[PDB]
Amino acid sequence: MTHDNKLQVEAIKRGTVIDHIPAQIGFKLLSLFKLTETDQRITIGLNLPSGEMGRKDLIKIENTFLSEDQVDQLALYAPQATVNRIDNYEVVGKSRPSLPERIDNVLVCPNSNCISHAEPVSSSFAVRKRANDIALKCKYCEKEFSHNVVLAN
Amino acid sequence: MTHDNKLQVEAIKRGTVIDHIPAQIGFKLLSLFKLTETDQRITIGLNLPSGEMGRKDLIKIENTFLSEDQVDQLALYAPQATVNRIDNYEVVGKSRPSLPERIDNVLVCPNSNCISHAEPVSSSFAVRKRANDIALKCKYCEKEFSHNVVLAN
Amino acid sequence: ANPLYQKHIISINDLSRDDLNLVLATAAKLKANPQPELLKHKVIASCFFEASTRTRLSFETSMHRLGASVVGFSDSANTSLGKKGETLADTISVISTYVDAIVMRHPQEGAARLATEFSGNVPVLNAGDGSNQHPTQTLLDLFTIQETQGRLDNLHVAMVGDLKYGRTVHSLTQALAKFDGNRFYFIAPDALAMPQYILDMLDEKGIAWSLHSSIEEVMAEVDILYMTRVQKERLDPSEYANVKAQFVLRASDLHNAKANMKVLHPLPRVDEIATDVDKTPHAWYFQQAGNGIFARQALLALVLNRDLVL
Amino acid sequence: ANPLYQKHIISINDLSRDDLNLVLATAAKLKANPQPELLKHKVIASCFFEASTRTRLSFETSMHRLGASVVGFSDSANTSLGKKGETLADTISVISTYVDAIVMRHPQEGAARLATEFSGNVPVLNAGDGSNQHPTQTLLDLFTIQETQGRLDNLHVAMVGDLKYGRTVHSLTQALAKFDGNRFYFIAPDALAMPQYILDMLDEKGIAWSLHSSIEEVMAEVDILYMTRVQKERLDPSEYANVKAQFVLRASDLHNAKANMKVLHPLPRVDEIATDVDKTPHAWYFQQAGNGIFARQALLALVLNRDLVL
Amino acid sequence: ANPLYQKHIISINDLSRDDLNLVLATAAKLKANPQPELLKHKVIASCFFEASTRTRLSFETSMHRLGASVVGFSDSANTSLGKKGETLADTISVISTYVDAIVMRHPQEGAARLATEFSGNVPVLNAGDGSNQHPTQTLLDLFTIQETQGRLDNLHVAMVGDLKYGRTVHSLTQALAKFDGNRFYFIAPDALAMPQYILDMLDEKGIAWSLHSSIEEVMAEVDILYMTRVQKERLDPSEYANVKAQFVLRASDLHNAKANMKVLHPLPRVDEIATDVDKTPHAWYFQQAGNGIFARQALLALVLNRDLVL
Amino acid sequence: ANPLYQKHIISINDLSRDDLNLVLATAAKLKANPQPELLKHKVIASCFFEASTRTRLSFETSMHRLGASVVGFSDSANTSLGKKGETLADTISVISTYVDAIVMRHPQEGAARLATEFSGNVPVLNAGDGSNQHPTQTLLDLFTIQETQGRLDNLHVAMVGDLKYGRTVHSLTQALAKFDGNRFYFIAPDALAMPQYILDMLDEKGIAWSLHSSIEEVMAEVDILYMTRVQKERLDPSEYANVKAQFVLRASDLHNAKANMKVLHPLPRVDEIATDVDKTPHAWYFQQAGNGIFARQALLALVLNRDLVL
């Protein structure tokens, strides 16, 4: 309990706030990373009027703390987000994402002869070469593609 | 004021608020009915305490008036949902989901040999409440199935 | 313009009693005075994506007896479409661009109805879609009941054979339920029973039906005996042959059949009706196949012609 | 007698500008007043030694809409010729003995031209010979450019896709080079580039052409956007999918296309043109397929008829 | 000698309680203290007239872990014996002059028993003969039931899937009905139910059985859950997809099972058992397939060795 | 234990310089002083889901010259595992309870790496997985390069043919780029060139490479000539036949080669190497295939034996 309002909604006690999600990535992040599969209160602000992007998205998951590498799976989609860790109404932690070395599960190999399609295994990609533009290599078929290509489909 | 409730509720000026979404259907309805594909302010609350009706979800969509047909579609998922429009800061219509004539788009034919699977076709099922259940007939293969067989797949 | 003008004949559930009677009264006129140039200059596509010779030869002869040209393919003999990844929506959007009507058979259920979304104004007539519908077989069957029995109501119709998977017994029960006072007798092995959705529909219209385990229990009262073939894949070798294989008609069983009783079978008949039955007045399976010519001619006439002077 | 009377339509390289314009002006009249009995009593052979449904159904419907009879076979579904060791020279010397024209597709390049050495006076029209020619696809394409753009010269034509192996982009570039001031834009992955012999021929006639790596660079200026399908056998799975698979048209890219721009594709289109493109005014791939009826009718009319009153 | 020495292993019906225990006892000894040169110098024939990679490899690996040599074949659309003209009986008569034992799987029932009359004194072991019998599958299921539950009697065994046509479930009930006090729960779709013969047998012994319609109805009392694959060929697509809120197994369903409850499946398990069951402690189908090696090693050692002091 | 003891051999990328030398060192010892009862009592599975007679026979002969037993299969249009419904993962999970090692070749890439997650502690060796990897071919090429040239570094290696899609040439460059100072000459038709990735890798190590267009341009400086087969499927007949005055090898071309220059080819060699090269001293492709036995013997002995004092 503290004043919410919604232009930049307020205060959960204890939990995570992922703020400065680009715009239209918020729901991708809920879908992809199954953040929704918790049983705690989640509050989400979509197309919001603020920080300079102008519009942005925001997700608040109370009582859950996600980090170190969870924050990093966010880097491909929401690299400029901040992940605030909150205890007792105070932001005891502000993190940002960084390119990890592995992105599990979330991607799909664009190589159609890859075995990964059919089987009870998770996708896995070795990540490399920061912000001049990321190459992703499948664990299984060892073909290396441009991230924008895997990310299209 | 406080017996917590709201914490200064996101009272929107003009819009649609879907309330009493039965827990876990909240995210389902966003994806299925593509409610986030808009540029207007949404605020979603998941696993909200409805102390009075256990738990719930609630989507607040601004300057949007999703209605008539659109509301009825939700009956298969959240039969217990009150949509309420808002023209200028309070309730100006509070509609409940009633079962529709047909359910388009959302739903998949259980029939693996139905032609809808391989093709550029939008699914469409004719709804029929066999007072005990709702049977759904595919318009293409014309096979009829329990709504629960369809609602997994 | 007649009600069927430019309609898609996709399902029996979509044709009303009045629609049925209109087709059946036109079949009777074309059978009585030929109109061999009615569809002159029309070109029709006979797309059979799954092969069916019986049905194709009959649809094309009917097209030929009203004067239309036929272009088309029989497949599962890999005549090139389906290649690359040409969707059925795209095939029918290109075939629809130069033929005046599409007759089509396809293995998946629902394919004829989808063709309808892509053909513009070219009628689609369904010649079979998977286990769903086959209207033109029901139309020729009905025409053979009307022509031999004088009526389509107050009939005592027995359906014998594999009633669970036989797509034609299921539609003929739905068409006959459009009419009055018919009574059904179902005689099927336990594994091949007439499905609940058919029975439930009959109960709800107040139509009488009953299960019997022998033709002998009902021969006496019966007007139309519609036999179906059991495919032995639907059972196992020993099940097929076991006491369940006696859904076979012989001449001896007709001993006491009404003088008007007729035996009907969509065909291939392989052994459920013995060759000696053929000699009796009651054998009407082949005359039923000849009637497929007038029922398919009538549908092509009514669908491509605004007005028809009869 | 008209210049095409009794000619073999084997290659686009053999038809002049005047020949092209004659076929295209006849296609426009047959499209405007039908002549459904012009080829009455003519019998034509539709020999498709390699199957092609799209092309066959269209050639035969065109034959049917001028009143000719069709006999013939589709193969690679082993319909018996090629057996024993019957040479193609011997097949065509026997088929030539009772049909009035042979339409044929064959897998080896050069087969239609050889048929010409054995047919006597029966015209041979080629419907595809291996990777060499396909005149009747170029004729329907040209007819669709003329009919939608009003002209065949001073056009800005973009060719997109597999330009190295696409037999139809190679002939349409040769036909369009017969005409004036056309400008070509080629957009192809590096492995599927437009061959030197085409480019060298363009340079030598002083026609302008350029390579671009995005439709976006050229949308604005373009009149005809001819897309081709890439077959993923021509590359490997990962090459196909890699940054080279974006030769795909979506509705969003047409944003700024000229109001007269048209998208053409011989078909099957599998994914290079997305389904949402269909809703736009610019989608003309299916209307292009319907035009194959008038361009093939015109060639059969002009070749079997001395004089034609139009 | 040992009871099974030089005996033919054709049907589970033919082996008494004590023979089944002898096998199961040897297989536990061979699992514990291996004897790799036990059939040194024996050549077994692996005649798989019908192909099964999993059964053929389990058998040949059995042969080789006891040091035997192997000659044989598998025949999908290929390699000559039988042919049609060459009898099974002349194949066996010829092959039984070359080998010391014949393991065979054949598509028609009784092929193994026919073999027995032509093999001389060469033992033949049945690896499947149509829908009749598969003794070595039942022998490894019972070994897996014995080493997980500790006994073969007083078990609450639930059998699920196609009970009408799973050959392994007909055999397993026969065999478990030689031990005492077992309770049977049969959860099948009524189209796919236990035949009356298994049931009529079970009542003559006084054995308790019940039929349920969901695994959820017995999860709590059960020791072995024997899941069978439901066969799409003799089911309609829409029937198959409509059975209740299904009868497949997921870990959510298991939250109720006994600590010692085990899930067995002869395999393959396309979709009746989900991937999450694979990581619970109740999952035992893959250990079940490894026990195949020890059960078939036992049968071969007992058949080909007079006395085995292992 | 030895470095490779119980290790999976899936990709050349995964084995360091020293591992490659360990293999090559063992294989020279096994060639010199054979040990026929080294894997006595081991059963290896030869799962060739894709058929290659030459690779399957070289492997099984390896297995047997070390005394191992073999169970397995090859599958062109036949025998059941995988099927579609049965996952590769359940095939491996089942087969890894039966054998001590799995050699497998599969058409989709990464199948061997998927296998690794289901085989338990059973080593899997890759014999080809689509266009990804084939480590035992590279291991025998390097053994052949080491025993003919005397070292693996400071070599002038010429690579010829389809460099874009030869999987063996992509691997061989990777591997030879772990030793020092090698110079690479790549003679390919530009449609079939080295991918930029091999080239970009090679520049990060500082390795010298050049691209030439005729073997004649480097014949004089070269030590290994690695000829690859040029693949007619993704080449047009007329493209294939037009490349220069060709890039096939004849003895006339060799009159310039060093005394120690050797011609290697993974085989088959349909026509890029003529029969007269076979009798020069530079011909080494068949000795190369015999070294296949010693390289795969080494890998199996090191994987399945902890310490080998040979």
Ligand SMILES: Nc1ccn([C@@H]2O[C@H](COP(=O)(O)OP(=O)(O)OP(=O)(O)O)[C@@H](O)[C@H]2O)c(=O)n1
């Ligand atoms: N108990 C609290 C405290 C803070 N916040 C959220 O924490 C986020 C950012 O933390 P804060 O440092 O308190 O505000 P800023 O200075 O703007 O953080 P930054 O500059 O990194 O965006 C805000 O979106 C705010 O909604 C919250 O929801 N609940």
Ligand SMILES: Nc1ccn([C@@H]2O[C@H](COP(=O)(O)OP(=O)(O)OP(=O)(O)O)[C@@H](O)[C@H]2O)c(=O)n1
């Ligand atoms: N300016 C306003 C007014 C109302 N609401 C929302 O509209 C919904 C309508 O409920 P209301 O009729 O105001 O009282 P309730 O008893 O909550 O409605 P119900 O009977 O459905 O529970 C509430 O969830 C409230 O958040 C809002 O967001 N903004």
Ligand SMILES: [Zn+2]
């Ligand atoms: Zn991959």
Ligand SMILES: [Zn+2]
């Ligand atoms: Zn359907």
